[PDB]
Amino acid sequence: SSEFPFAKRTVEVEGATIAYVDEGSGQPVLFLHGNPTSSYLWRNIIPYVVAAGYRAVAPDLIGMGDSAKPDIEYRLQDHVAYMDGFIDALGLDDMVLVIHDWGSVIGMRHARLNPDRVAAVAFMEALVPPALPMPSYEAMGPQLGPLFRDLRTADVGEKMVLDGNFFVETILPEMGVVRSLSEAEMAAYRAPFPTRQSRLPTLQWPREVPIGGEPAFAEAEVLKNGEWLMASPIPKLLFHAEPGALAPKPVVDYLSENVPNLEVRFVGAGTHFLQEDHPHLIGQGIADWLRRNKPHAS
């Protein structure tokens, strides 16, 4: 359950190494994680799509998991270039996306710009309207608001994240998961981030969240993704939890009434990293949804 019974493969993308899980055969299901996780996040979900007869492909984002740590800024722009390049390197086509957090932004953008290549999209705790973009820190509540302001403040964020590893050591196990992560699980999540410098991607990601218009690029991407989501005819699947974080009940209710061709699966108690609290419901869910829809790209 904390076990990771997958070998990883490596491929060169834009001069750097991307590590990835590659299991099964045939139609690809591409799993995209966010901050501060890796392909490890999907370890208990992957076996469900493989047994359903699909090829499970789960890369580690650049600078994360077992992927390379190049001297780059790790902005949204950077991450999309490596993931698009990864898709190209593997020649992935007729894709089902399974996406979370910043992975949802990268994933939806890819579907948006390549509608001929994406069969279907499963997502959860996504950075997408109506919840995103955020108008202000105040709009995030008395906990997340000041926390993200801190992360986005010079010196403060560096001390918290680079020196303290706060995203990995606190936000992930304490705020983002209902159950207690085991020692083996925490070891896996901290393994890519033993040094100050290595932690940069976990600091840059909260600095990418579009709040009060900043930064402009991520804001534009999230808004255009929202337009794609409301207009796209392709089969979609949403997992959500109570109370949730990016997607509380009223956000889900809105999405369920307005997104075309959307299946919604409540998983019970959870906040953000739903895969840790309900991997089997999520796994069974994706497989069942694929069995009924058999989605293919036009």
Task: Provide the annotated active-site residues.
Answer: 101, 125, 272
Q: Are 31 and 42 in contact (CB under 8 A)?
A: yes
**Nearest distance from residue 267's CB to Cl ion, in Å?**
7
Angstrom distances, CA of residue 242 to CA of 84, 107, 125, 293: 33, 24, 11, 27
**Beta strands at 236-243 and 262-270: parallel, antiparallel or unpaired:** parallel
The partner residues of 27 in beta bridges, in order of sequence, read none
Instruction: Give CA separation, 271 vs 19, 86, 107, 125, 174, in Å.
Output: 28, 30, 21, 9, 10
Q: Which of residues 31-70 bind Cl ion (CB under 5 A)?
A: 35
Which one, 8 or 109, has the nearer CB to Cl ion?
Answer: 109
C-alpha dist (Å) from residue 277 to 131, 215, 238, 264, 265: 22, 31, 16, 17, 14
What's the Cα-to-Cα distance from 274 to each of 61, 247, 289, rounded to whole Å?
A: 19, 11, 18
Cα of 45 vs its chain's centroid, Å: 14
Contact 232, 115 (CB under 8 A): yes
Cβ(53)–Cβ(99) below 8 Å: no
Q: What is the x/- site pattern for Cl ion, positions 205-224, by CB under 5 A?
A: xx------------------
Is 21 in a helix, a strand, or coil?
strand
Query: Is 221 or 232 the residue whose CB approaches Cl ion more closely?
Result: 221
Nearer to Cl ion, 9 or 280 (CB): 280
4 residue type, one letter: F
In the bound state, the residue with its beta carbon closest to Cl ion is 280
Shortest distance in whole angstroms from residue 250 CB to Cl ion:
22
Could you tell me the smallest distance in angstroms from the CB atom of residue 196 to Cl ion?
18
Of residues 8 and 278, the one with the C-beta less far from Cl ion: 278
As measured in angstroms, the least distance from the Cβ of 205 to Cl ion is 4
Binding region for Cl ion (CB under 5 A) out of 28-36, 127-135, 186-194, 288-296? 28-36
- Smallest distance from Cl ion to CB 279, Å: 5
Q: Looking at residues 267 to 296 of the shown chain, list those that interact with Cl ion (rule: CB under 5 A).
A: 278, 280-281
Which residue number, 35 or 39, has a Cβ lying nearer to Cl ion?
35
Residues 149-208, interacting with Cl ion (CB under 5 A): 205-206
- Binding residues for Cl ion, rule: CB under 5 A, are 35, 205-206, 278, 280-281
